Design a protein around this nucleic acid. Structure first.
Lengths: 359, 53, 131
RNA sequence: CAUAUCGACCGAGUGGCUUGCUACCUCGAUGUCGGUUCCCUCCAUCCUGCCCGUGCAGAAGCGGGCAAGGGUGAGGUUGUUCGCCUAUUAAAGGAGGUCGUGAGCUGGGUUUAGACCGUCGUGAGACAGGUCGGCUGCUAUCUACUGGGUGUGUGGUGUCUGACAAGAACGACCGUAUAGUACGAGAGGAACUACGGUUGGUGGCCACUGGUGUACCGGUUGUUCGAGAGAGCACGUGCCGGGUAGCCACGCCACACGGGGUAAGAGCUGAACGCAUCUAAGCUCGAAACCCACUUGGAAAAGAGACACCGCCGAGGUCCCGCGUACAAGACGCGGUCGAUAGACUCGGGGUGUGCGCGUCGAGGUAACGAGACGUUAAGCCCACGAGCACUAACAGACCAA
RNA sequence: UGCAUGAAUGGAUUAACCAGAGCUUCACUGUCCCAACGUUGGGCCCGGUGAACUGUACAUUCCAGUGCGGAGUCUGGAGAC
RNA sequence: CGAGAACCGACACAGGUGUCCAUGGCGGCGAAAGCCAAGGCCUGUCGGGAGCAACCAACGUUAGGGAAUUCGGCAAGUUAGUCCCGUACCUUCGGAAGAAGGGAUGCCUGCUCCGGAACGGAGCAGGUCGCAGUGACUCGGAAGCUCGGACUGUCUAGUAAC
RNA sequence: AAAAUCCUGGCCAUAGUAGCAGCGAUAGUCGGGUGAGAACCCCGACGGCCUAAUGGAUAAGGGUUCCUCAGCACUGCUGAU
């Protein structure tokens, strides 16, 4: 036709959860695992960067601007609880957990510190009931004899310091892909009691998919849903209405064709985001730089967007999608598809643009 | 890389350069001193300008 | 080949721009630009770097009337960069060119962009000013 | 030289896009032509991929095969369909869907009532002639589809699995090196591969450029409040000038390869038929096409899933309160003093363009009076952003739950 | 060279006038490229008030076929809590 | 009562229906706009809630391009008041004409002229603020060619105003 | 009578759906009074609307609609003291 819009994401509902849930995980060999194959914090707006060109066959091996783009604030994040899954037929099902007696002092909301008495609302993950071993044993025994499935960890990003966030942490399980299994099972156990950061699984130059719900409005008409033609002038005054949808035996149309509905919202990954930078907020410089405890490298003066200043661990993900927006939560990944080869541990990052957003 | 109307510094990766008719006109810090320039206004005259005072 | 510089398309078809000299040029108006695609509510598009087909609206000589082509030298719409962030500057722009790609007018009024030279030399050449 | 190519006569078919026929269907009514918008399809393929032939040196072609992944426009006259014309283009293919599409639009034409002209008629009036004007009803019951919920069938929190489903998520072109090379007397003039870019499509984003911005600031006409100051109205900004945030495109970013199996075709080994043979068994390659890869959806897949932890007298959840990264209702997400969630205040960051008052100057005028200039004054006024800051308000408390 | 003009069935022509028919130019502009944001009233939820159209029956349909040759209801399949 | 409920229209109907108040203030040419008195009213009579989505009705602003839209510039926009300068073809000498086009415009201080005077009008000099001085409001876009009917006027109450 | 777009009456679905928004007149809000009951009955304050008319006086036409007291089954686009 071509058909307007594209089937793919479907149906195109709203999005359950405003947290992305990656459908697939990288498959790996020569791996730890990460546990946090995916690890993420979320968006502040972004400027642009001047970057040295990397290593192309091409002549350009000099300064060039790329949208140093949407710097997202991450991390650190903690994985409390590696969860086993074991046995089919049916599908994956949880086994038993692990634990952690660290309990970030804010993980009450959406977690612990639930009323002891049962509440009509279901209780979230809270635990004082502990059996570190037993869980370990259960998993090990259901390893040799039965099975196990890929193991993952709970994770929860803390809002140690982000503009307008709270003890609430909305985290979801990220899988660990190590070697055999039992080797990896050990790995997720070590990185259990303990905490992590981006500088773990990550690397500048390395490509990662990014996922998050798009920001967007509620139901709208056909035109700015999948694009549809407006007009012609008659019912021009009225809202854009597509020609009748399907006509024949079924009275109703399944259609797959232009219908009003929710838009905005989403849940979609992007593929092969390069991660030009890794970063921080603490001052570190090859040579003398500003002093008096300056701030993060890339946050615009005037703050950025509604939620300003960054002063801690960052990530720059060029050509910002980001697959969502301002102060939401993207999830990082590893680049499952991959195309071009990885670049380097770092990029030159000759200049970063810092300017008030307005102006 | 310094602004040549308002003054100070220009962020590493932002700030435009536009070109006027014949080559002329320099950078900007951003759209701020920009429109200010568009309206005939001299930076050495208004408010905080590095050039100012 | 590669512009190496991102460009947003400032002017669509039916747009009127200024030749930065041909002979008897004037203001050409845009007709489809190079091999390009379309979509619903397409609005063809054009931008610095893209060869365009055009007609001479103003004129003097019997250049006016039409046929073309010309390449858009400058545009009012942003750009991109490699270093900084970039500009838009002047008014839009365009110079008639032969299938060879050479200008069909000795002098080019106005400046020209840097990575327009890369795409077509000779155009950048009789620049008068670059950047 | 039938068979590179063109190809009559005659003969056999396929399609259901044109036309005709049926006078079979409808006259207690299936809304016209053309256009538009929006979806699907056909071949019998125009381009692109891979191939065969050539009257194939090369280059450019011509013809044929596989193949439907993707692509295949903008304008001037005319109501036109059609068609003529122009400049672009890889190319600007054709056809079906009640000549798709009026409970979607338009109403220019046909074909009401008014009127003119020509022709015909004694005349009323006529014309398969021309012309000007000449209306577009309905609150969706069912069904269909797009999205959203409540239930039933097969304790909760968080993280996943993937049966299947969607995609063109990419298509194409120009240029440079190759190379003024191979090939060629010369004229002329390639390729593999590696690069740069453009165009069309797709997704997202706003630092940059641009638009808006009846937030805001200023200038100014008329009039009313006695003047001044400060204001109302002039459609819902009087007009003009500037413009923050946000939203946007004319702005910016990202969108492979590769692998597997094939078609046409090129071959291998190889018989039937001791030879020959790409085929009969077997096999190596080989298309933009097919599968995978990649993006999106997806436990209601009834084989209705998996894992970890918490929990069954309390895990969690709903209501509530303060707000949004969300939003037509519903939903979603965050925070709730173990607090920076919102407001106030201050500062930072921004927009206008220097305030009232007073002092000096000011064409002049006895004087009264005096448009305006300068100073005080980077003033004054203002902000949908940020930070600091518990001052104020997130209280109080309810309910459900194995 | 008028298919088939023509003189008060008036011919030709014409300043001024015109919500009359056609065309061109400058100016203008969201008519368009190509759509975006905002404003007010609705729309959505809640209290109250409260009709009409229409109705042989049955009715979750879809692809095809068949039939008075334009079927949700016949036939075969497919799909369907 | 004399009417967005006392009249006619089946109704407490956005329709229709005569006369006098035309000398209330500012404004300005004004019985104009806008604002405000006197006088009248909150009865053009259902409310409550969600930043309040899609879609719809009215409408504002949109960069660059500028009629490419369309049967057709339909719709919207542009111009605009007043004074000075200046004003083409054609013509029935009336007109065409506000042709076109160009300039000016506020406030403040002090004045001159016309008049008996106005809280009437026309100017002068100097000072001075803004992006913009008919600052809102009120307020023409302009030019040319052709066809028809000379003109003002009449007409299908209810799809035709020619 | 099963039938006549049959006549008359009654009744279901439609629907707790449409309308009670659109008009150059967008109009109320906070206290208080009365009352069995008050968003719209009355008082005050604050905020607005109308200016050849939503003001004043009248013709026709209506015909008691005027005033007072008592009321709310009817009428009033919701409620009503």
């Amino acid at each position: 036709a071509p058909r307007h819009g594209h089937l793919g994401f479907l149906p195109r509902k709203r999005a359950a959860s405003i947290r992305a849930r990656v459908k697939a995980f990288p498959k790996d060999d020569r791996s730890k695992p990460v546990a946090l194959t995916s690890f993420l914090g979320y968006k502040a707006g972004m400027t642009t960067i001047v970057r040295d060109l990397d290593r192309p066959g091409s002549k350009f091996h000099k300064r060039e601007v790329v949208e140093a783009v949407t710097v997202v604030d991450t991390p650190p994040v903690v994985v409390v609880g590696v969860v086993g899954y074991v046995e089919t037929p049916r599908g994956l099902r949880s086994l038993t957990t692990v634990w952690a007696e660290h309990l970030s002092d804010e993980v009450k909301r959406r977690f612990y510190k639930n009323w002891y008495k049962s509440k009509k609302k279901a209780f979230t993950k809270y635990s004082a009931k502990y059996a570190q071993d037993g869980a370990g044993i259960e998993r090990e025994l259901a390893r040799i004899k039965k099975y196990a499935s890929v193991v993952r960890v709970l994770v929860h990003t803390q809002i140690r310091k982000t503009p307008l966030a709270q003890k609430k942490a909305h985290l979801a399980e990220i899988q660990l892909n190590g070697g055999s299994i039992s080797e990896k099972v050990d790995w997720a156990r070590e990185h259990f009691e303990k905490t992590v950061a981006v500088d773990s699984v990550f690397e500048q130059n390395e490509m990662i998919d990014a996922i998050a719900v798009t920001k967007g409005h509620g139901f709208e008409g056909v035109t700015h849903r999948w694009g549809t033609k407006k007009l012609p002038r008659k019912t021009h005054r009225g809202l854009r209405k597509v020609a009748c949808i399907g006509a024949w035996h079924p009275a109703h149309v399944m259609w797959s064709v232009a219908r009003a509905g929710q838009r905005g919202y989403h849940s979609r990954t992007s593929i092969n985001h390069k991660i030009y930078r890794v970063g921080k907020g603490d001052d570190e410089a090859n040579g003398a730089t500003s002093f008096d405890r300056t701030k993060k490298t890339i946050t615009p003066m005037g703050g950025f967007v509604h939620y300003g200043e960054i002063k801690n661990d960052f990530i720059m993900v060029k050509g910002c999608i980001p697959g969502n927006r301002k102060r939401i939560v993207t999830l990082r990944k590893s680049l499952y598809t991959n195309t071009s080869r990885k670049a380097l541990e770092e990029v030159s990052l000759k200049w970063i643009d810092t300017a008030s957003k307005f102006g | 890389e310094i602004d040549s109307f308002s003054g100070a510094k220009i962020y590493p990766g932002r700030g435009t350069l536009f070109v006027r008719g014949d080559s002329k006109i320099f950078r900007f810090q951003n759209s701020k001193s920009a429109s200010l320039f568009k309206q005939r206004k001299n930076p050495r005259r208004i408010a905080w300008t590095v050039l100012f005072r | 080949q590669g512009t190496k510089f991102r460009i947003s398309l400032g002017l669509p078809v039916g747009a009127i721009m200024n030749c930065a000299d041909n002979s008897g040029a004037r203001n050409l108006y845009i007709i489809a630009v190079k091999g390009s695609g379309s979509r619903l509510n397409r609005l063809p598009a054009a931008s610095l770097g893209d060869m365009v087909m055009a007609t001479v609206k103003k004129g003097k000589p019997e250049l006016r009337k039409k046929v073309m082509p010309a390449i858009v030298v400058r545009q009012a719409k942003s750009w991109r960069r490699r270093d900084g962030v970039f500009l838009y500057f002047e008014d839009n722009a365009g110079v008639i060119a032969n299938p060879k790609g050479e200008m069909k007018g000795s002098a080019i009024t106005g400046p020209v962009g840097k990575e327009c030279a890369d795409l077509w030399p000779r155009v950048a050449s009789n620049s008068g000013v670059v950047v």
